[PDB]
Structure 1
């Protein structure tokens, strides 16, 4: 079948750069990443899950690497968050369920993302959350042996406090913490601190349990009981994903399914 391997770059999705590519024959839409990268390709080749951005393949034309990835027409979770407001709680709960399914998957295969934030959480046509960008990702468990991390990476507002205080740390509690910062952004439409350090007034207020202040003031007591268990400074006392799935707000019926077509009489 001629020309089925030809793609047209029709618009920039993000900045290397990510372009929306449309197949000349089929009109199938994919996102093409134009660019460390050797590790990114190898990690993406291991991934196959409904809440992880699909990897179709890669091609190298000289010095330029072309990564063929899933186009998520719903865009970023970031653009669903209304500044200083957030989003309806049943939406945030459904996105948080999906974020956990993805993170459970990655952790089960011994991969840590290390930069979870709403800019990286994409949405497909049915608003299904997909984790993206494996550029900072790494193997923390191999041959059933865990290796402690020491490399400082991520984005300061989403980084766990042990990354700024300790030489070495477990990988899984770091991704749990960032998921708790994402949940805060979804329910309050604002980040609680610039970084999780004692020098940060907002961070000290949280540790002092001053939940009468923002963003905690905008969050209902049931999701806020969950954020109290996630945003725990000691990563050994911090809630794990198996225990998150047992949380009351996490199991609270709130959201109806996607409205199906209906007629009366």
Structure 2
């Protein structure tokens, strides 16, 4: 940090990651911008192992819809991760509250989200916290999946394992996390992508959590798409959401079948 901070301006805070605060750093000579995630390992006894794992997963990644990882180093009890600066900001800030964004924009972002998730799943990694705060944008509005603090390996070579950790952000979590002791990784990420699509199209999360005790979730199970947020969503993308937000993960649409969906393939304005 010492010589680094002589040559690089830590201009401002960008946000909070799973494991630490992220700063914009700009080199005074070249004006290169990088995002620096600063992780205080004293915040938990397991933080050193947890951040080591985030680093390890980052080293596996190379895809146009995933935030680039440049490197890392430790200074005392602080770990520094050096990440792509995504100058388009968070997808969250393209969503007008209670309105969403135009359907063509939501469709394009959703295609890019699928590309990134397909990539991750192909290498056996699940993100586990997909939400608009963790979907950044570059200078050409290309989506970049961000923050692998909660990510884990669900397939070792061609051998899947079940997961059991209740992690993620509650309004985005799939119902099987509240019902099953162990579950498949991929349908959990598919579900959160559906909640992201809902938010992009209507500017509103549909429920606190996907429990039968949550009235808004019961309303969706009972096909009450005449209520918000659903009544704001056109029938074509709503038909896709009906296939994604399926309670039984075994019956839930898979990404290869999302690719065949009418709305997914629909030419928009």
Fold match, TM over 0.5? Answer: yes
Q: Would the aligned equivalents of 1:3 and 1:25 in 2 still touch at CA under 8 Å?
A: no
CA shift, 1:253, in A, is 1.1
Number of residue pairs matched by the alignment: 254
Question: Structure 1 residues 208 and 2, CA, compared in 2 at 3 Å: closer, same or farther?
Answer: closer
Question: Structure 1 residues 237 and 8, CA, compared in 2 at 3 Å: closer, same or farther?
Answer: same
Question: Structure 1 residues 203 and 3, CA, compared in 2 at 3 Å: closer, same or farther?
Answer: closer
Equivalence map 1:1-265=2 (5 Å): 6-15=7-16, 16-34=20-38, 36-254=50-268
Alpha-carbon distance in 1 for matches of 2:3, 2:203: 48
Question: Structure 1 residues 180 and 2, CA, compared in 2 at 3 Å: closer, same or farther?
Answer: closer
Scaled by the length of structure 1, the TM-score of the pair is 0.93
CA shift, 1:24, in A, is 2.6
CA shift, 1:5, in A, is 9.7
Q: Which runs of 5+ in 2 are unaligned?
A: 39-49
Question: SS state of the match for residue 6, structure 2?
Answer: coil
Q: Which runs of 5+ in 1 are unaligned?
A: 255-264
Alpha-carbon distance in 1 for matches of 2:14, 2:3: 28
Give the 4+ runs in structure 1 shifted more than 2 A.
1-7
Q: Would the aligned equivalents of 1:117 and 1:182 in 2 still touch at CA under 8 Å?
A: yes
Question: Residues 215-245 of structure 1: CA distance to partner in whole angstroms, max 9, x if unpaired?
Answer: 1100000000000000000000000000001
Q: Would the aligned equivalents of 1:4 and 1:25 in 2 still touch at CA under 8 Å?
A: no
Question: Structure 1 residues 61 and 204, CA, compared in 2 at 3 Å: closer, same or farther?
Answer: same
Scaled by the length of structure 2, the TM-score of the pair is 0.92
Question: Structure 1 residues 48 and 59, CA, compared in 2 at 3 Å: closer, same or farther?
Answer: same
Question: SS state of the match for residue 136, structure 2?
Answer: strand
